[PDB]
Design an enzyme around this catalytic site. Structure first.
Site, PDB file in Angstrom:
ATOM      1  N   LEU A  43     -36.308  36.810 -33.101  1.00  0.00           N
ATOM      2  CA  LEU A  43     -34.949  36.656 -32.586  1.00  0.00           C
ATOM      3  C   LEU A  43     -34.833  35.327 -31.841  1.00  0.00           C
ATOM      4  O   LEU A  43     -33.778  34.695 -31.849  1.00  0.00           O
ATOM      5  CB  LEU A  43     -34.581  37.830 -31.651  1.00  0.00           C
ATOM      6  CG  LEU A  43     -34.469  39.221 -32.305  1.00  0.00           C
ATOM      7  CD1 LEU A  43     -34.277  40.321 -31.258  1.00  0.00           C
ATOM      8  CD2 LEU A  43     -33.319  39.287 -33.315  1.00  0.00           C
ATOM      9  N   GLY A  46     -38.121  31.299 -26.051  1.00  0.00           N
ATOM     10  CA  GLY A  46     -37.692  30.653 -24.810  1.00  0.00           C
ATOM     11  C   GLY A  46     -38.876  29.905 -24.236  1.00  0.00           C
ATOM     12  O   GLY A  46     -39.882  29.759 -24.931  1.00  0.00           O
ATOM     13  N   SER A  49     -41.485  33.206 -23.454  1.00  0.00           N
ATOM     14  CA  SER A  49     -41.789  34.295 -24.376  1.00  0.00           C
ATOM     15  C   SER A  49     -41.174  34.043 -25.729  1.00  0.00           C
ATOM     16  O   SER A  49     -40.328  33.154 -25.879  1.00  0.00           O
ATOM     17  CB  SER A  49     -41.259  35.616 -23.828  1.00  0.00           C
ATOM     18  OG  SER A  49     -39.840  35.634 -23.782  1.00  0.00           O
ATOM     19  N   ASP A 154     -31.863  35.324 -12.405  1.00  0.00           N
ATOM     20  CA  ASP A 154     -31.578  34.617 -13.657  1.00  0.00           C
ATOM     21  C   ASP A 154     -30.392  35.263 -14.331  1.00  0.00           C
ATOM     22  O   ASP A 154     -30.355  35.458 -15.561  1.00  0.00           O
ATOM     23  CB  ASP A 154     -32.807  34.602 -14.565  1.00  0.00           C
ATOM     24  CG  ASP A 154     -32.744  33.536 -15.663  1.00  0.00           C
ATOM     25  OD1 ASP A 154     -32.027  32.533 -15.477  1.00  0.00           O
ATOM     26  OD2 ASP A 154     -33.475  33.680 -16.667  1.00  0.00           O
TER      27      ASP A 154
HETATM   28  C1  LIG Z   1     -19.444  34.592 -20.503  1.00  0.00           C
HETATM   29  C2  LIG Z   1     -19.998  35.666 -19.636  1.00  0.00           C
HETATM   30  C3  LIG Z   1     -19.127  36.891 -19.492  1.00  0.00           C
HETATM   31  C4  LIG Z   1     -18.207  36.978 -18.447  1.00  0.00           C
HETATM   32  C5  LIG Z   1     -17.433  38.114 -18.280  1.00  0.00           C
HETATM   33  C6  LIG Z   1     -17.577  39.185 -19.144  1.00  0.00           C
HETATM   34  C7  LIG Z   1     -18.493  39.123 -20.185  1.00  0.00           C
HETATM   35  C8  LIG Z   1     -19.278  37.975 -20.375  1.00  0.00           C
HETATM   36  C9  LIG Z   1     -20.334  38.006 -21.438  1.00  0.00           C
HETATM   37  C10 LIG Z   1     -20.111  37.546 -22.742  1.00  0.00           C
HETATM   38 CL1  LIG Z   1     -18.603  36.798 -23.150  1.00  0.00          CL
HETATM   39  C11 LIG Z   1     -21.065  37.656 -23.738  1.00  0.00           C
HETATM   40  C12 LIG Z   1     -22.298  38.236 -23.470  1.00  0.00           C
HETATM   41  C13 LIG Z   1     -23.327  38.413 -24.562  1.00  0.00           C
HETATM   42  N1  LIG Z   1     -24.624  37.789 -24.262  1.00  0.00           N
HETATM   43  C14 LIG Z   1     -25.650  38.121 -25.266  1.00  0.00           C
HETATM   44  C15 LIG Z   1     -26.995  37.600 -24.807  1.00  0.00           C
HETATM   45  C16 LIG Z   1     -28.142  38.019 -25.670  1.00  0.00           C
HETATM   46  N2  LIG Z   1     -28.033  38.545 -26.877  1.00  0.00           N
HETATM   47  C17 LIG Z   1     -29.347  38.653 -27.343  1.00  0.00           C
HETATM   48  C18 LIG Z   1     -29.851  39.141 -28.551  1.00  0.00           C
HETATM   49  C19 LIG Z   1     -31.228  39.147 -28.751  1.00  0.00           C
HETATM   50  C20 LIG Z   1     -32.099  38.670 -27.763  1.00  0.00           C
HETATM   51  C21 LIG Z   1     -31.605  38.186 -26.557  1.00  0.00           C
HETATM   52  C22 LIG Z   1     -30.225  38.186 -26.368  1.00  0.00           C
HETATM   53  N3  LIG Z   1     -29.426  37.793 -25.307  1.00  0.00           N
HETATM   54  C23 LIG Z   1     -22.558  38.669 -22.177  1.00  0.00           C
HETATM   55  C24 LIG Z   1     -21.601  38.537 -21.192  1.00  0.00           C
HETATM   56 CL2  LIG Z   1     -22.031  38.975 -19.580  1.00  0.00          CL
END
Ligand SMILES: CCc1ccccc1-c1c(Cl)cc(CNCCc2nc3ccccc3[nH]2)cc1Cl
Ligand SMILES: Cc1ccc(O)c(C(=O)O)c1
EC number: 2.7.11.1
Length: 327
Positions: A43, A46, A49, A154
């Protein structure tokens, strides 16, 4: 020298709990069987990891496997102890197993799988209601970990998984998390640039849970104003200048004076003099659907230089911004 600081909440949690709770170096890791997991696809990688989609062949369920790089492999007991301490907590990622990877010879953490909704789709299509809903879900995870004597350090969009179909959110990557001990001086080289609190940027080491609340404010500002990232620093120094162009320099000097902090003299030639801006300056026809007086008031109470003056996670949950959210 610097004036000491302590959190205004949850100072005594690691005093009240037994030493085995926070003394992660004493924890004995109960290793599982690496052969129960079949890696399916990488996936991402970083700096600490490599993460994989995998299948637990003992139950046929999807899992995520995080294989630590040798550089992060030293402070693995800290991440394991934090994950076991928080396991079952609201919106905290569930650590399912810990195995020794046969190839890397390092620990591999096995987590529950979250069917993530595409990150760009979420940023571009969540509604005002959905943003409040998910912000409330993040607050549940933050108040839980803070109440458990842990700071995440973080908080950023990459570390929040959302499965929008099932309205399911998880706070992940506890590799930088730490136990909060009043009076302890922590490393300021934590969090990603755009989410770093002013305490980190001015080199104030006696910080606490409130660092997570600044990071949460940066996420909210980016989302509601359609400005990715909200504070767009070129480096850690320009990062504070970008914050000062919004919050103003007078409140920055009041903050550093309260804690008897001396700015790095390299700021003398770049900081300038800036008034505090009203939050309405960032509203325009392309983000007005996401902004409300309640959103701006909530943001104002998170994005404060003084870490002791920010809303705590529990106080934030009773803010009017969340009144519309179905509870
Ligand atoms: C812009 C931040 C935000 C403010 C207010 C409400 C929601 C969000 C948000 C969004 Cl748009 C998208 C995500 C989605 N982030 C996904 C991160 C992720 N997906 C993965 C898939 C596989 C491995 C690691 C991963 N990390 C999370 C949040 Cl908090
Ligand atoms: C489920 C999941 C996916 C990717 C990750 O990096 C993590 C974590 O670090 O805890 C968890």
């Amino acid at each position: 020298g610097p004036v000491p600081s302590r959190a205004r909440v949850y100072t005594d949690v690691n005093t009240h709990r037994p030493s085995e709770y926070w003394d992660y170096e004493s924890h004995v890791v109960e290793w599982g069987n690496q052969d129960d997991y079949q890696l399916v696809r990488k996936l991402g990688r970083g700096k600490y990891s490599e993460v994989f989609e995998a299948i637990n062949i003992t139950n046929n369920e999807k899992v995520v496997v995080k294989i630590l790089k040798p550089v992060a492999a030293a402070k693995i007991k800290r991440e394991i102890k934090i994950l076991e301490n928080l396991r079952g907590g609201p919106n905290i990622i569930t650590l399912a197993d810990i195995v020794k990877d046969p190839v890397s010879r390092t620990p591999a953490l096995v987590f529950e799988h979250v069917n993530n909704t595409d990150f760009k789709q979420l940023y571009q299509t969540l509604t005002d209601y959905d943003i409040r809903f998910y912000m409330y879900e993040i607050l549940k995870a933050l108040d839980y970990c803070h109440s458990m004597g842990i700071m995440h350090r973080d908080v950023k969009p990459h570390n929040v998984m959302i499965d929008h179909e099932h309205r399911k959110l998880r706070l992940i990557d506890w590799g930088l998390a730490e136990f909060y001990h009043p009076g302890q001086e922590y490393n300021v080289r934590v969090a990603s640039r755009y989410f770093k609190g002013p305490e980190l940027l001015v080199d104030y080491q006696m910080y606490d849970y409130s660092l997570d609340m600044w990071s949460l404010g940066c996420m909210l500002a980016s989302m509601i104003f359609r400005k990715e990232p909200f504070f767009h620093g070129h480096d850690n120094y320009d990062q504070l200048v970008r914050i000062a162009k919004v919050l103003g320099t007078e409140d920055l000097y009041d903050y550093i004076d309260k804690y008897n902090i001396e700015l790095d003299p390299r700021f003398n030639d770049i900081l300038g003099r800036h008034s505090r801006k009203r939050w309405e300056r960032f509203v325009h026809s392309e983000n007005q659907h996401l902004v409300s007086p309640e959103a701006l008031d909530f943001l104002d109470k998170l994005l404060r230089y003084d870490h002791q003056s920010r809303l705590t996670a529990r106080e934030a949950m009773e803010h009017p911004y969340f009144y519309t959210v179905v509870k």
